[PDB]
Amino acid sequence: ASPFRLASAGEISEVQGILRTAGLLGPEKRIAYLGVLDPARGAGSEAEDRRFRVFIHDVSGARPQEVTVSVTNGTVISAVELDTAATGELPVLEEEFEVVEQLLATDERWLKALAARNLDVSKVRVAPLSAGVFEYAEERGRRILRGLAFVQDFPEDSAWAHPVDGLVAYVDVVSKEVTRVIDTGVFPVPAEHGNYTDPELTGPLRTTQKPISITQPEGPSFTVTGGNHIEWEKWSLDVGFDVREGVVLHNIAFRDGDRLRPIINRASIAEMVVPYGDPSPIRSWQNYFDTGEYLVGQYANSLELGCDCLGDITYLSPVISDAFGNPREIRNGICMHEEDWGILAKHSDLWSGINYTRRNRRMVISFFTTIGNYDYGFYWYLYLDGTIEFEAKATGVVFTSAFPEGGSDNISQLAPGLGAPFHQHIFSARLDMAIDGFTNRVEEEDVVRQTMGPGNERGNAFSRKRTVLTRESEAVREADARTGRTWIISNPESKNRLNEPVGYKLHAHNQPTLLADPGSSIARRAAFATKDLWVTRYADDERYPTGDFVNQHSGGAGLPSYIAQDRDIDGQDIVVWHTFGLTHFPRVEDWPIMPVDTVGFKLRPEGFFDRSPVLDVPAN
Amino acid sequence: ASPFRLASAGEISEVQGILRTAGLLGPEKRIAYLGVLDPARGAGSEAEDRRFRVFIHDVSGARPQEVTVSVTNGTVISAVELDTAATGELPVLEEEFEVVEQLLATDERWLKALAARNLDVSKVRVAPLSAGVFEYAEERGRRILRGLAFVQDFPEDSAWAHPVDGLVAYVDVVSKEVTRVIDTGVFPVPAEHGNYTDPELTGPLRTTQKPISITQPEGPSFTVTGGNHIEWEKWSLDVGFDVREGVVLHNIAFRDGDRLRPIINRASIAEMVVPYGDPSPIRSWQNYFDTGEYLVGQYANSLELGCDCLGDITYLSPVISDAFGNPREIRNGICMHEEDWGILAKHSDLWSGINYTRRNRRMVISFFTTIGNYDYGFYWYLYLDGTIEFEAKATGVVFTSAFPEGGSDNISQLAPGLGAPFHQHIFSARLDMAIDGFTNRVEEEDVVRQTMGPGNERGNAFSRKRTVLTRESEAVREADARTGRTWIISNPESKNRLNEPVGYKLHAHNQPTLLADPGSSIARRAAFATKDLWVTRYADDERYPTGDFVNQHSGGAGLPSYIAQDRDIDGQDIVVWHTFGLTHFPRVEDWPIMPVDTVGFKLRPEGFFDRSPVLDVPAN
Ligand SMILES: [Cu+2]
Ligand SMILES: [Cu+2]
């Protein structure tokens, strides 16, 4: 019944039949993206119209199309041919990955480079990686992948332990031509294995860990209705899933007494870029846009009870489409549970003799994805006190290279002859704000130091200042940890009982932003990553910080072009885009499989409530 | 047996007996501090000689004494008379707090001030606060407390809801004389109650929270031997307790195969300061040195099972001395338990076909203290992967004032007429490092951005730089979040298998440091708080960043005096002092009782191990 329900297998099958009958899904077509569209802005929108947006690829070389379908009326709403040399290529297809290694295996330059290094071609795995846009004019308008080679000594071997440095190949996966094979010189292939389930490497397994039993004897405190609507501890929201973005949170609201108060209309991680900082021509082109180029939702793991998710777990199994329009279920792809979160508030008062302690809890919504060697966990948290928090967890296997004799300023050594180039993992959170409604504004809050003198005779005073961001041209902001800079999203028309506008405060981790030179290709295509905070006026077609078609787009798409419109954002329908990330200089302890490292952000109420919202939590 | 065992009741009783026999603890004497001394540097030393340090106050006004005794030999080792006008007053005694309200209730100036406000003296509570050093010459060499008043409407009322602004009194607690009563004018006393257990303010309690049960059917995975020696998942340490610093960690080591490897010799929170930034003369003197002036261990709570500490809890009950030398047990004052901590490492490999998931856990050592309106939790965490983390949790009731008509730049409004002055909560971590032994050094690590051009033709490279701190004069460092700055403590004489010095990396939160003007009294007394990192050469008498006697002591002791020795710290026995804090602009949601906010730091291995140290964790 809800317009925000998860897509069903039936809806996807109905989309496939509609496209096929319209002549848009023949043998030479592939679906590169399929997803449901959000309802348009309308507080009276009640007529059910489930629409899907589809990117259709053509393997014979015809121009691709963007199609919008109504599953409701069974009609094609629009269909436009795309000029990819202008607006960018479609996302990478899972079936194009295997093609790279197959084509190189019969290419004579590739075989000769392998022969010089005495490598069996049957043992050489190729990582197929996105191409980017650099100085090669012949790749414009063509779908290119670039390949790096790794040796797999046997079928169960971890190939990441054995990079083949000095070698890279470019492949046109449409015409199936190897365009270039570049051999910069022979490097020894590192010999130690990295097999983290080999008893030879692990040693005897620990027998010292005792079980921790987390049970909910009366079931969980949250309810799920209509498939994906959660109610928990005065929170209300809908859990969506998109094949590009992954888990998406809709309609986050909080019941304050007898009022359901909106906070966030839509929350998602709308891009994620992994730029490498090794100047070697073998890797200086390497930049993953995991969300925009690869689609992180389509690689979500099925999550195992007790291993991946511990406690009383409620699962969602979302449906996506395969490349032919068949529905595919990601069984146990989203975990939902609550967990204890320690002390919430505590005071023992000498004067009143009252001793008071209450415990905190958080609601957790999570999924995990695997893109090649990397694995990323996406965690959304809701706390009793109104805090909302996101956390990314990075693990998997680091990407490797040779470690050069004489060292490197841009690569860490992990094992004899084995290196790991420096890189970053940078996320963009898109937060379509709705603090008590859609009339919102953003203020930047800095700490203000004061000088000893008149009115500050003892030199103890300090203060704070707030600056309203009024237009998009002034709403590109950077962090300043030294002055405790935060950002407040308020509703100037909804006041608390002290007649102050209600608000929420964004707390960033203040990690470094994109380190690449400003003139570089990655700084142009990942412009969002150069600044900590962006604010735009809402528009329904401004969805991703990097534009709709990220793969092999020349740059400038997404946020820099949106911001150029210089729209009013002072008491308007606005969207907050927060950049945050990890700068990873790999350490020996990250090898051969990396312990989790985390980064995130959180939002806390700032005069949104008239007093603490957890006074009604029982002692238990 | 172990020289780091907790002080026993018998030892404290013996100190009492020894001081009495020596004529140092007659009826007019009071114990203001009593603590066990750590063994001096020496592998062998005195078989065991348990020594105790005592500060002895005299209630007839005679000069106090610092005394060291050996409980083993039954002897006084040294006893020195203190000139408190020069070196500082002793910490505040618990029995002195009660003096203040009782003395004011008979003072004609105080009664006249309350009569002017139509207040009944029998309902006026006085918060007795540390005095600091300002422009009052008659206070030099006297023990002074300052009092701020709050109305309690009935015996169970929260007095913090009803501050009596415009009024402050100064009291000599030894001669029992009210030195000054200052009245800057009548403010309305805020009328709303702040009683967070009153059903009329909480409303009906929630019935929606279902139980979370956390059990360990085979018991915990750690062992406790010798009363306070912990072994847990390759970690080894001794948990100490001191009445000034609270929980102290000794001898933190990690068993790496055959070898027990030292990491940290002694870890403590060695000072904490809470400065207020309201320039009103009623409060511009307000700064708490909770550790140095009040002794935070003295006010440790007894922690309730299932409420304060949830799960399979092992308790320690430390023993301290009262003001007369009798042992007092802080029952269930320390909780110790292990917690599940989500995913440790995870990878699904396409090429090998192996799926791999491991879970993380942490060991938690915690205590809570209550000082007036404030409650602080101190948590130390040890993780499976070698990470060490500290977290402070701040809750309780915010300190209040009137909210002036027309507003304030230095005070938040919480309720009609009720204000909360801006303030900070700043901690100093003293980390006596011992990375694989005592030969250590600190490097400051910054990210290095690189310009596009020769050798970096695509503008993607970035790097890092490390700067060795070689002398104490250059070891006073500030954060730089923009350049990702961290600090590495390494042992230049212990190399990993890649022939690199083993190390640990300090990750700060990069919160603002002390905001007060550099010429202010608080900036001089809390000089440690103005910089993020200090490194000193180890010395037995350099224990606290503010010095031994903080109460009513001007600047001239502590970290700035230590650093002036300019000693060699490059490959020596060194101590890291890390400043970190919260800057608190109170919000409406902090009233009437504050939900927990947090700050901390962590240390992670950086080439300390030869590979990941958690390959031998089993799959459950
Ligand atoms: Cu990484
Ligand atoms: Cu505070």
* Domain co-membership, A237 together with A185: no
* C-alpha–C-alpha distance, residues B534 and A421, integer Å: 32
- Token readout for A444 is 């930047």
For residue A423, report the distance from its CA to the centre of ligand 1, in Å: 6
Taking 3-state DSSP, the helix, strand and coil percentages for chain A, each rounded to the nearest 5, stand at 15, 40, 45
* C-alpha–C-alpha distance, residues A389 and B527, integer Å: 35
* C-alpha–C-alpha distance, residues B469 and B303, integer Å: 42
Residue A72 structural domain: 1-87
Distance of CA A101 to the CA centre of its chain: 28
- Token readout for A172 is 């046109």
Q: What residue type is assigned to position B353 of the chain?
A: G
- B360 in contact with A, Cβ within 8 Å: yes
Last residue of a domain, one of A179, A195, A211: A195
The DSSP code sequence of A559-571 is HHHHHTT--B-SS
* C-alpha–C-alpha distance, residues A256 and B36, integer Å: 52
**Smallest CA–CA distance from B155 into chain A, residue:** A352
* C-alpha–C-alpha distance, residues A132 and A126, integer Å: 18
Judge contact between B522 and B516, C-beta under 8 A.
Answer: yes
* Domain co-membership, B421 together with B518: yes
- Token readout for A215 is 């049970």
Name A21's Cβ contacts closer than 8 Å, sequence gap at least 6. Answer: none
Rg (CA), chain A: 26
* Domain co-membership, B557 together with B462: yes
* Domain co-membership, A28 together with A129: no
How many angstroms separate the Cα of B472 from the Cα of each of A278, A589, B111, B475, B541? Answer: 36, 31, 54, 5, 17
Judge contact between B333 and B367, C-beta under 8 A.
Answer: yes
- Token readout for A262 is 């909106």
Q: Which has the closest alpha carbon to A315: A212, A215, A220?
A: A220
Other CB atoms within 10 Å distance of the CB of residue A488: 20
* C-alpha–C-alpha distance, residues B450 and B459, integer Å: 7
Which ligand sits closest to the CA of B599? 2
Burial state string for B148-158 with b = 16 or more CB within 10 A and e = fewer than 16? bbbbbeeeebb
Burial state string for A133-160 with b = 16 or more CB within 10 A and e = fewer than 16? beeeeebeebbbbbbbbbbbeeeebbbb
Q: How many domains does chain A have?
A: 3
Name B446's Cβ contacts closer than 8 Å, sequence gap at least 6. Answer: B464, B465, B467, B480, B483, B484, B485
Last residue of a domain, one of B170, B195, B220: B195
Task: Report the run of H or E that residue B572 belongs to, with start and end.
Answer: none
* C-alpha–C-alpha distance, residues A458 and B521, integer Å: 7
Judge contact between B245 and B270, C-beta under 8 A.
Answer: yes
Q: How many CB contacts within 8 angstroms connect chain A with chain B?
A: 430
Q: What residue type is assigned to position B501 of the chain?
A: P
Name A153's Cβ contacts closer than 8 Å, sequence gap at least 6. Answer: A123, A162, A193
Contact: B216, A217; criterion CB under 8 Å: no
Task: Identify the three-state secondary structure at position A408.
Answer: coil
* Domain co-membership, B442 together with B585: yes
* C-alpha–C-alpha distance, residues B172 and B75, integer Å: 35
Instruction: State the virtual CA torsion across B2, B7, B12, B13 in degrees, nearest 10.
Output: -70
* Domain co-membership, A229 together with A189: no
B423 in a labelled binding site: yes
* Domain co-membership, B75 together with B100: no
Task: Identify the three-state secondary structure at position B115.
Answer: helix
**Smallest CA–CA distance from A589 into chain B, residue:** B612
Q: Which has the closest alpha carbon to A227: A334, A302, A301, A328?
A: A334
Cross-strand pairs, B433: B264
Q: Phi first, then psi: what are they for A405, rounded to 5°?
A: -60, 135
- Residues of A within the annotated binding site? 288-299, 371-376, 423, 425, 584
* Domain co-membership, B37 together with B125: no
Other CB atoms within 10 Å distance of the CB of residue A97: 18
- B592 in contact with A, Cβ within 8 Å: yes
Q: What is the experimental resolution, given in Å to one decimal place?
A: 1.7
Chain A residues in contact with B308 (beta carbon < 8 A): 343, 346, 357
* C-alpha–C-alpha distance, residues A18 and B316, integer Å: 70
- A40 in contact with B, Cβ within 8 Å: no
What CATH number should be reported for the domain holding residue A612?
Answer: 2.70.98.20
Task: Identify the three-state secondary structure at position A16.
Answer: helix
* Domain co-membership, B8 together with B136: no
* C-alpha–C-alpha distance, residues A391 and A383, integer Å: 14
Place of tokens 């503008």: B459
- A307 in contact with B, Cβ within 8 Å: yes
What method did the depositors use to determine the structure?
X-ray
Last residue of a domain, one of B72, B87, B102: B87
Q: Which has the closest alpha carbon to A54: A71, A41, A42, A72?
A: A71
Cross-strand pairs, A374: A371, A396
What CATH number should be reported for the domain holding residue A23?
Answer: 3.10.450.40
Name B601's Cβ contacts closer than 8 Å, sequence gap at least 6. Answer: B389, B390, B429, B506, B507, B508, B509, B578, B580
* Domain co-membership, B208 together with B187: no
| Closest CB from B257, B348, B385 relative to A375 | B348
Rg (CA), chain B: 26
- A396 in contact with B, Cβ within 8 Å: yes
Residue B254: HSE in the Cβ half-sphere, 13 Å Cα cutoff: 20
Judge contact between B520 and A452, C-beta under 8 A.
Answer: yes
* C-alpha–C-alpha distance, residues B484 and B505, integer Å: 12
Task: Identify the three-state secondary structure at position B588.
Answer: helix
Contact: A219, B208; criterion CB under 8 Å: no
* Domain co-membership, B190 together with B219: no
* Domain co-membership, B244 together with B127: no
Judged on CB neighbours under 10 Å (0-12, 13-18, 19+), B425 is: buried
